[PDB]
Design a protein around this nucleic acid. Sequence first.
DNA 1: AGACTTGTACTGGAACTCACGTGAACGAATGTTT
Length: 70
Amino acid sequence: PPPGEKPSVFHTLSRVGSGCTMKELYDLGLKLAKYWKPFHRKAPPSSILCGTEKPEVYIEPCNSVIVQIK
DNA sequence: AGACTTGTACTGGAACTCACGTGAACGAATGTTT
């Protein structure tokens, strides 16, 4: 972002779907359950920028969580 | 590829039980003292 501001736009990197136990996935779902929004290809959100791979449901970055990927 | 879940088998420790040992205590007989 411009100096002294929070990030506004995001660029997709990759899907990850392994490395979490069932309980961790349940807790993550409960945390982010309220903030999921349906994804419409015709009116994509401004904050998230995607290529050919698009999600079924998108969550605004302000309410999401950081994940470590190996 | 990778990561988690499920199923099978194994091994060590907990708990329970019996055998054996040791410690302390005691009534009766005997020996000693007065």
